[PDB]
């Protein structure tokens, strides 16, 4: 992929992270907690997960950005709609409004309904997110590989704006602790 040049600097917004969630001063890392982090409620919070939305948000053009996603046994990354749901159990699926690919239990998947199975050799430790807002694609690349695609989706009906979509994963297992890091362009 040549999609570098198209680089956005996201940065995270506190005000949608679940309450157990450490942003860091300069909104380029999140991590898990281990308890709630004294802050109080609000309805933008995802209340059921480790989730966390980009303060950008995305109606037009191409955006390219990059994840460290080094030592984590779980998580979720890609895009969603502004509009999506924050509280209670739901689905990451395109007719839920997100676009999105997991790591879970040692294997990765892309958040179609039902889930896809990707085919990866080289386990990524950093992950490049491409939307092409006209066209209708999100595409994701692993860097540690030297840019190769894992997933396009295609015909995304995004169906309002966009916002870059976080998810540390639960640490019951003590290995899942790492954060999450907008890496520098
Ligand atoms: C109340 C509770 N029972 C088990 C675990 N937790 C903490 C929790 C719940 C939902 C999301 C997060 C995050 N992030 C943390």
């Known amino acids: 992929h040549h999609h570098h040049h198209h680089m956005v600097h996201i ?73 999506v749901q924050r509280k209670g159990q739901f689905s990451l699926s395109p007719e839920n409004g997100f676009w999105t690919i997991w790591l879970w239990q040692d294997s990765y998947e892309a958040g179609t309904s039902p889930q896809t199975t990707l085919h990866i050799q080289v386990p990524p430790c950093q992950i490049g997110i491409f939307v092409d807002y006209e066209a209708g694609v999100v595409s994701f690349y692993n860097i540690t590989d030297h840019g190769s695609l894992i997933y396009t989706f295609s015909e995304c009906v995004f169906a309002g704006p966009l916002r870059p979509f976080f998810n540390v994963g ?16």
């Not at 309450?19 to 004294?38: A, F, P, Y």
């Open 170 to 185: 639960f640490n019951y297992s003590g290995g899942n602790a790492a954060p999450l890091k907008l890496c520098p362009l």
């Open 11 to 83: 940065t995270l917004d506190r005000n949608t992270a679940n309450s157990w969630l450490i942003i860091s001063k300069d909104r380029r890392q999140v991590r898990m907690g281990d308890t709630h982090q004294n802050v109080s409620d609000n309805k933008e919070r995802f209340s059921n997960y480790p989730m966390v939305l980009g303060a950008q948000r995305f109606s037009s053009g191409k955006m390219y950005w990059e994840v460290d996603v080094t030592q984590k046994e779980a998580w979720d990354l890609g895009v969603c709609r502004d509009s």
